[PDB]
Amino acid sequence: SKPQPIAAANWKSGSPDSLSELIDLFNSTSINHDVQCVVASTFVHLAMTKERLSHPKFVIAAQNAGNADALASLKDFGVNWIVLGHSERRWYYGETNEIVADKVAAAVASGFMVIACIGETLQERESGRTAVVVLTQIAAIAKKLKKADWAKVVIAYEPVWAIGTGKVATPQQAQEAHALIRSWVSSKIGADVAGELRILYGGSVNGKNARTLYQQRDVNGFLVGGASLKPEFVDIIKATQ
Amino acid sequence: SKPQPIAAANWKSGSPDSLSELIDLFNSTSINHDVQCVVASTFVHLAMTKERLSHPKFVIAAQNAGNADALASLKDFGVNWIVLGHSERRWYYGETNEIVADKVAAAVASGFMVIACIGETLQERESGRTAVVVLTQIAAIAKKLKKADWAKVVIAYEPVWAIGTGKVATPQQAQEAHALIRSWVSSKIGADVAGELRILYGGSVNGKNARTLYQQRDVNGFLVGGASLKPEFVDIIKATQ
Numbered sequence: 001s002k003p004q005p006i007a008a009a010n011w012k013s014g015s016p017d018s019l020s021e022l023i024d025l026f027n028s029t030s031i032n033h034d035v036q037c038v039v040a041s042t043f044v045h046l047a048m049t050k051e052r053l054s055h056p057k058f059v060i061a062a063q064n065a066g067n068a069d070a071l072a073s074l075k076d077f078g079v080n081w082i083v084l085g086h087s088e089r090r091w092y093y094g095e096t097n098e099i100v101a102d103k104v105a106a107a108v109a110s111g112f113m114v115i116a117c118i119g120e121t122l123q124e125r126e127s128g129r130t131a132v133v134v135l136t137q138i139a140a141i142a143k144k145l146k147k148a149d150w151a152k153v154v155i156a157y158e159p160v161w162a163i164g165t166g167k168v169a170t171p172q173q174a175q176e177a178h179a180l181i182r183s184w185v186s187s188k189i190g191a192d193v194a195g196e197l198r199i200l201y202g203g204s205v206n207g208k209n210a211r212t213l214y215q216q217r218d219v220n221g222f223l224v225g226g227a228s229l230k231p232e233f234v235d236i237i238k239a240t241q
Numbered sequence: 242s243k244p245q246p247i248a249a250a251n252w253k254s255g256s257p258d259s260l261s262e263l264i265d266l267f268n269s270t271s272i273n274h275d276v277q278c279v280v281a282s283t284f285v286h287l288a289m290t291k292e293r294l295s296h297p298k299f300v301i302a303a304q305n306a307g308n309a310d311a312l313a314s315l316k317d318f319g320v321n322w323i324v325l326g327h328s329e330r331r332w333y334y335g336e337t338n339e340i341v342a343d344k345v346a347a348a349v350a351s352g353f354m355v356i357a358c359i360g361e362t363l364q365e366r367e368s369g370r371t372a373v374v375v376l377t378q379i380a381a382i383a384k385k386l387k388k389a390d391w392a393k394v395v396i397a398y399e400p401v402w403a404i405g406t407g408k409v410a411t412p413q414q415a416q417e418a419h420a421l422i423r424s425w426v427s428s429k430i431g432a433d434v435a436g437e438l439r440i441l442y443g444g445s446v447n448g449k450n451a452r453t454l455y456q457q458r459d460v461n462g463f464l465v466g467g468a469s470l471k472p473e474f475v476d477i478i479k480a481t482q
Contacts, residue, residue, distance in 0.1 A: 088284045090314060091284075091314045091318045092283075092284035092287070092303075092314070092315070092318075093284075093307065093311060093314075094306075094308060094309075094310030094311030094312070094313065094314040094315070095310070096310055099310075121317070121318065121319075122292075123317075123319060160288075163288075164288065164289075165288065165289075165292065
């Protein structure tokens, strides 16, 4: 039915010691279903996790790449997944739809599994421009990808207003945005591709809200920030059953 | 007499929780005089404050912009004020008078209210080169601004040796530098402009020293770093009466 789900952690902060305790918990956790778990972080924690994380279902990812040289070095360092187009890169650092599109194409060429992020601001949401915004973002990425490349792409839909604010989208809001993105992909690229495509939801996900969100027809997992620094991340992974 | 004063906070560090407590304190504080309050920060706290800060007298600002795309995105994100040419950008990152001048011109074009920072090092101060340094910095900015643009500019004078060191300038030192900058502007651009111009003082300002500094004829407010992370920032705002 639904493609293999992904439960990605976005370690935006935390201390080396507290984090290794988490890694121990994960390593000792049996997941009785097929799900790809991803732990994304910065150089600070990347060396530790790359060596301390042993769970068969987990993989590590870099939080961003500034250029082709970094993609190359990261690849050599042994990192195969990467998160691109995350909120702040777009609104704080000014990366345009075109720029992240180029980054996504480059990463894929270098052989990475890419989690490309998209989402609208509170202003856009309220102005009723969600659908146009989201599709423009996704369209920019598509313009640079060859049909084969989609095999290496995961889309993460995160309303900018839901990230770190405590304000999660509703099962209906998420499902609608995801359904829209999938439709666009199906009609523009192919239904074969659209069906294989994982579209994750990110924006204040936690152990208590995950299942309802996951139950939606078009939600294939989550990109989790805050709750991924806590052991409740385990409940979030179990919610992708 | 003096133009409307500005009490700007420069949140260089701090935790999300501690910071929201401050925002609550601010939001519940009545200021019985006309003053523009500004809370400047990085992407980390910018999303929270933009949503949690409700005080009618407060506005939020970005701590820097790396290029035109960032100015555009920030503008769209809903940020209208920006701090440029701050100490570290000049001495640590190597931004020249010319570069920050260009940044100031660009920001103004994009529609921002700009706090352009200037100031000399301890070496320069001691070598007795304060006046030449400060004027060269300001002159570089002027070379790129059209007379109309000055309406969107606020100048912050912060001796590099006073920032974060605990070593504040004396009411006489600040007043002299401010008087000099205003004179230059008056004779080079116009007295109309010079009079409307807010020149703030920054460099180890606190609740205890603010009033004396503010009492000077040419001091129009403060850019505060350390003390802005504490509730004494309220006393600093009251000092602009």
